[PDB]
Amino acid sequence: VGSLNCIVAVSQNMGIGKNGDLPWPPLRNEFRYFQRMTTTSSVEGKQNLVIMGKKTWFSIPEKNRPLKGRINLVLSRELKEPPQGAHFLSRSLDDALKLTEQPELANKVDMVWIVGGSSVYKEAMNHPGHLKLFVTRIMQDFESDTFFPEIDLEKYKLLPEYPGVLSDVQEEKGIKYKFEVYEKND
Numbered sequence: 107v108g109s110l111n112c113i114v115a116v117s118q119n120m121g122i123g124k125n126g127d128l129p130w131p132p133l134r135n136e137f138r139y140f141q142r143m144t145t146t147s148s149v150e151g152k153q154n155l156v157i158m159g160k161k162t163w164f165s166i167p168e169k170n171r172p173l174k175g176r177i178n179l180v181l182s183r184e185l186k187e188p189p190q191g192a193h194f195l196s197r198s199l200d201d202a203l204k205l206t207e208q209p210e211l212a213n214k215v216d217m218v219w220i221v222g223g224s225s226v227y228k229e230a231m232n233h234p235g236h237l238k239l240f241v242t243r244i245m246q247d248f249e250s251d252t253f254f255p256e257i258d259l260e261k262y263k264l265l266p267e268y269p270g271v272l273s274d275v276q277e278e279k280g281i282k283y284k285f286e287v288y289e290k291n292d
């Protein structure tokens with residue numbers, strides 16, 4: 107199994123969802139960036155794993171579920187089988203990471219991408235080890251009811267650039283945004 111990563115799009119007031127919907131209007135190139143980054147795997151014969159909480163899974167429009175070309179794993183203690191269209195179910199992020207070393211997935215998974223939501227990000231971000239955060243900064247305030255956890259910059263370094271990630275300001279539908287990559291190893 108390869109690197110562990112979080113990927114998020116977040117407004118200036120730290121919002122990531124409004125009743126699960128994006129707080130901002132849909133941004134086509136931001137969507138394309140998310141698909142490209144989470145799907146691209148260099149290791150021949152493997153796919154990336156996407157891990158998400160139950161609410162994040164059901165916030166994805168059905169036409170976009172499962173995230174194609176990736177192994178889709180949902181976290182839930184209430185669910186007793188993977189949701190329709192998903193591939194795997196784990197009770198916790200720890201169990202999901204443990205599963206990636208079981209024979210059922212050990213040689214199948216390259217990169218692991220945590221795609222939401224708030225509590226899953228928080229657990230990943232505060233667990234020791236090597237972790238990167240791919241953060242799209244939506245540079246406006248938007249009404250939200252779920253939020254990204256604080257990034258502790260004592261441990262997460264903002265990288266000066268990263269291959270395959272544009273470094274300059276983007277704009278869609280009149281909304282400026284930018285792509286950042288953070289890395290910790292503790």
Ligand SMILES: CCCCCCc1nc(N)nc(N)c1-c1ccccc1
Pocket residue numbers: 113114115136137140141162165166167170220221222242
């Ligand atoms: C259905 C795919 C939406 C992709 C655009 C939104 C998005 N952007 C970034 N950079 N990270 C994320 N985790 C998400 C996201 C992915 C799934 C659900 C909610 C937000």
